[PDB]
């Protein structure tokens, strides 16, 4: 069935508009952590970013054209610290997966669009995922152990992928001479 | 002066809500173009949407913080076959240089904001030479001139830098093997 008219189709847009603001701030916050020295996460906001936009063109794949207006609120600024950032992203990322994909999944299913009520649904739980890595940075941050831990592990440099061991990075890597700023856990997924 | 509570404040907003919507469309019509088999015309959107990014970017960076609500239309999709892309996103163009930017730069200028008001001026001259680009490209598409023209010209192969003279690109790069999608008019601007 057609979306013309419904609130569903009004709510496809709204996410689509919120979708690609965040999309943009992901990529400032992004750059705003390289110039703060933190590349891993610098990384982690691009990336996001770029998830962003692909969750934005499965929205917008299913509108049926025309303009539409839509009334909502959004984030007026701003880029600060990366810390601040961090915290603001998650606060977004959380009101997205705990208020607007459920209810948009809602009433969704209430006028009968099934398919797109599970795609709000399963959206929910990739920003769910977000949060919890811009939570976990954060901390890491407030916690002082972006670059240095307890106990002695593997650091990985993300410019050349030198492999250093001990409690924290190295001040510089010994193999490409980049800052500690590149370096992050070693971490394998495979 | 502060914007909070001002016009300009929710128009500024409304620019950036709009300018990230506009950079996911053009990168959603880069890659239509790709599979359309026209590079240059691929590039061409996704450094436009870059360079939304960049509108967005400055217009952001006005913003004070906090939560404001907005009422705008917004194209509701839609990703159909390339010429049909580079029509909508120079109807979209013509909308922002036209009507939008000069009236935010007008009310911008009423409430006091000098520097806002001229942002918004200049913003409208860059959207106005991207509508020119689209333009001159729906048109190619429709002439069928995009790559073949009436008089003898250089081609280059954007994948390998190749140069083709005669009145068509090639079906194949001798030099790289890529398909004539690849190719465009040699253009020297230095
Ligand atoms: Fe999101
Ligand atoms: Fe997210
Ligand atoms: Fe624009
Ligand atoms: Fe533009
Ligand atoms: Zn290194
Ligand atoms: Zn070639």
Redesign the interface.
């Known amino acids: 069935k057609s979306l013309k008219g419904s609130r569903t189709?009004k709510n496809?847009?709204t996410a689509?508009?919120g979708?690609?603001?965040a999309?943009?701030?992901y990529?400032?916050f992004g750059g705003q952590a390289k110039k703060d020295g933190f590349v891993q996460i610098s990384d982690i906001f691009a990336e996001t970013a770029d998830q962003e936009?692909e969750h934005?063109?499965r929205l917008?794949?299913?509108?049926?054209?025309?303009?539409?207006?839509?009334?909502?609120?959004?984030?007026?600024?701003?880029?600060a610290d990366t810390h601040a950032n961090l915290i603001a992203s998650a606060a977004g990322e959380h009101h997205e997966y705990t208020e607007m994909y459920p209810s948009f999944a809602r009433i969704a299913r209430e006028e009968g669009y099934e398919e797109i009520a599970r795609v709000f649904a399963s959206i929910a739980v990739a920003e769910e995922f977000h949060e919890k890595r811009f939570l976990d940075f954060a901390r890491n941050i407030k916690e002082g152990r972006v670059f240095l831990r307890e106990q002695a592990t593997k650091w990985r440099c993300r410019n050349c992928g030198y492999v250093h061991e001990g409690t924290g990075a190295p001040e510089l890597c010994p193999a490409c001479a980049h800052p500690k700023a590149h370096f992050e856990l070693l971490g394998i997924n495979w």
């Open positions: 189709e496809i847009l689509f508009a979708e690609s603001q999309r943009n701030r990529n400032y936009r934005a063109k917008f794949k299913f509108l049926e054209g025309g303009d539409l207006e839509i009334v909502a609120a959004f984030p007026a600024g701003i880029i």
